[PDB]
Amino acid sequence: HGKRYRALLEKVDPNKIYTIDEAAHLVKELATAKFDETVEVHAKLGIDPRRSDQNVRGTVSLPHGLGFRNDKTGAIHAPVGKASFPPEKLADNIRAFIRALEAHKPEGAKGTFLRSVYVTTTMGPSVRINPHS
RNA sequence: GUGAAAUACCACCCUGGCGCGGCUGGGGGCCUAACCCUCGGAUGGGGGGACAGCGCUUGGCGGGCAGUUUGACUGGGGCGG
Numbered sequence: 001h002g003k004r005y006r007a008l009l010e011k012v013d014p015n016k017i018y019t020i021d022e023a024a025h026l027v028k029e030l031a032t033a034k035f036d037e038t039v040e041v042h043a044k045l046g047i048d049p050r051r052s053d054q055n056v057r058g059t060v061s062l063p064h065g066l067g068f069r070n071d072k073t074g075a076i077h078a079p080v081g082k083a084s085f086p087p088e089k090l091a092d093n094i095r096a097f098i099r100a101l102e103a104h105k106p107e108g109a110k111g112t113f114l115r116s117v118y119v120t121t122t123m124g125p126s127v128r129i130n131p132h133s
Numbered sequence: 134g135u136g137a138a139a140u141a142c143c144a145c146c147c148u149g150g151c152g153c154g155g156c157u158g159g160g161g162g163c164c165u166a167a168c169c170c171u172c173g174g175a176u177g178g179g180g181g182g183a184c185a186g187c188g189c190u191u192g193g194c195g196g197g198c199a200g201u202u203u204g205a206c207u208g209g210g211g212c213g214g
């Protein structure tokens with residue numbers, strides 16, 4: 001990685017677990033990218049893909065616009081928009097989509113459903129952050 | 134573009150791997166100081182040595198011992214039924 005990214009992860013704690021208002025404004029500083037950032041915030045899952053009775057999908061439209069499914073390995077995939085909308089239009093949206101997403105949990109899903117969440121970019125670094133609060 | 138998956142900087146993951154560290158389980162070697170043996174002598178020497186022995190605990194072999202069980206009918210009883 002470049003010094004774009006060498007100055008990047010010197011300013012973030014994957015070490016310290018963080019909350020989601022804490023981590024909402026840290027998204028637009030850590031992209032040293034040219035261009036074009038669509039933000040991706042990712043979560044590992046508490047479910048088993050090896051049974052498709054527990055499989056998940058659909059298409060919903062987020063509140064302010066562009067600007068979900070499980071793989072066979074069982075993690076989360078979806079873009080929430082363009083970098084676009086500023087830090088507190090993110091925190092506004094940051095509790096929005098997942099509380100819409102959680103609704104789809106199958107019954108035979110064993111254990112804590114959101115295993116972790118790292119706010120990141122299509123271009124950028126990893127902070128340990130909580131979907132919780 | 135004839136394979137359906139796209140060959141970007143990123144994450145979140147799969148799979149084996151190595152690395153570091155955290156909680157760690159298992160082996161091996163040496164040591165002596167507990168513990169054990171010993172020494173005309175000993176607050177010491179020599180030998181064994183964290184084994185062995187002993188406590189609590191686990192599962193097992195276990196007539197060497199112990200307590201008992203080992204039915205009724207029945208032309209006696211058993212055998213047979």
Ligand SMILES: [Mg+2]
Pocket residue numbers: none
């Ligand atoms: Mg030795």
Ligand SMILES: [Mg+2]
Pocket residue numbers: none
């Ligand atoms: Mg000795």
Ligand SMILES: [Mg+2]
Pocket residue numbers: none
């Ligand atoms: Mg010695």
Ligand SMILES: [Mg+2]
Pocket residue numbers: none
């Ligand atoms: Mg001695």
Ligand SMILES: [Mg+2]
Pocket residue numbers: 179
């Ligand atoms: Mg000695």
Ligand SMILES: [Mg+2]
Pocket residue numbers: none
């Ligand atoms: Mg012992």
Ligand SMILES: [Mg+2]
Pocket residue numbers: none
């Ligand atoms: Mg007897």
Ligand SMILES: [Mg+2]
Pocket residue numbers: none
């Ligand atoms: Mg017996």
Ligand SMILES: [Mg+2]
Pocket residue numbers: none
């Ligand atoms: Mg009696």
Ligand SMILES: [Mg+2]
Pocket residue numbers: none
């Ligand atoms: Mg009789």
Ligand SMILES: [Mg+2]
Pocket residue numbers: 208
């Ligand atoms: Mg008779």
Ligand SMILES: [Mg+2]
Pocket residue numbers: 208
């Ligand atoms: Mg008779």
Ligand SMILES: [Mg+2]
Pocket residue numbers: 209
């Ligand atoms: Mg008779």
Ligand SMILES: [Mg+2]
Pocket residue numbers: none
């Ligand atoms: Mg008889």
Ligand SMILES: [Mg+2]
Pocket residue numbers: 213
């Ligand atoms: Mg008989």
